[PDB]
Write a protein that binds this ligand. Structure first.
Ligand SMILES: O=C[C@H](O)COP(=O)(O)O
Ligand SMILES: [Mg+2]
Length: 290
């Protein structure tokens, strides 16, 4: 079966003996890539991560999430030092930490643009689906089934605040947890309204994330590779979503998981197993020989 293979754009399996780059570091999206559909790290994945640590391969999270919500989802692995959060690429790069927890990227959203996005979202009535991200906390204006759905997966609850409090907050992104029935339209509105102002990404299901226009996960990738004197040619990125496109296309070695869209897969060098098929275990096998 093809359940566990990694293939190039011609459908040919990638073989270790044909590689000419040692992979020293792997950057991976969390939900939809490392985590299976149940938001868990599979045992096969965990077993391969243990071996990657024994061999000195670095595994770095690159996510739209804050580090706080990551810790709530995979904390048990973090506590056992099996997955490191530092260094890490959070909020789609806008908050990227080195191993000392210093922000090597800190891309706050301009406050005029914040308020314009806010007023626009109230105008088109998606403000109720908004989760605003400060450095250390998230905020929403009300709770509904869509906010509920976001809390369940994110596993970290926003504080509920009044509308007029937003002006005082220093934010890095906003995430709209949208009903499925208005995703496609709302995405068109935001992209038309804020082109060359803000990144707009459909990252996961009906999530729409807006963050610093000149920042993405790949900017974080470059910073962390730089920190450890690792050429980009010895890095590998894997992902599934729109917010992974820049890091998949920016590295010579990248893997789009099988569950990714055709757009995301096209941006990647290789296509691997789905997130439910232990994608990073097979990546580690193919590229690092376990
Ligand atoms: O809520 C989860 C995120 O939208 C997906 O996270 P990721 O960037 O690690 O795939
Ligand atoms: Mg993802």
């Amino acid at each position: 079966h093809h359940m566990h293979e990694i293939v190039d754009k011609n459908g040919k399996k990638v073989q270790k003996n044909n590689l000419n780059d040692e992979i020293k570091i792997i950057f991976t999206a969390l939900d939809g890539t490392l985590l299976n559909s149940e938001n868990k790290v599979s045992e096969q994945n965990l077993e391969s991560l243990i071996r990657a640590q024994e061999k000195g391969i670095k595994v770095v999270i690159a996510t739209g999430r804050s580090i706080f919500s990551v810790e709530n989802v995979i904390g048990e692995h973090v506590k056992k030092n099996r997955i490191s959060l530092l260094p890490g690429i959070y909020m789609n790069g806008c908050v990227t930490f080195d191993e000392k927890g210093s922000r090597v990227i800190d891309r706050i959203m301009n406050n005029d643009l914040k308020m314009e996005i806010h007023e626009f979202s109230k105008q088109i009535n998606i403000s109720k689906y908004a989760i605003w991200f400060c450095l250390e906390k998230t905020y929403c204006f009300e709770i509904n089934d869509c906010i509920r759905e976001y809390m369940e997966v994110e596993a970290l609850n926003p504080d509920v605040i009044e509308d007029n409090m937003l002006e005082g907050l220093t934010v890095y992104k906003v995430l709209f947890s949208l009903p499925e029935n208005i995703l496609e339209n709302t995405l068109k509105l935001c992209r038309e309204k804020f082109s060359h102002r803000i990144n707009v990404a459909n990252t996961f299901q009906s999530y729409v994330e807006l963050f610093h226009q000149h920042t993405n996960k790949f900017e974080g990738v470059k910073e962390i590779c730089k920190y450890y004197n690792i050429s980009l040619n010895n890095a590998l990125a894997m992902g599934d979503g729109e917010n992974d496109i820049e890091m998949l296309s920016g590295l010579t070695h990248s893997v789009g998981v099988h569950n990714a869209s055709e757009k995301v897969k096209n941006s990647a060098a290789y296509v691997g197993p789905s997130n439910n098929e232990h994608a990073i275990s097979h990546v580690l096998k193919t590229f690092c020989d376990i």
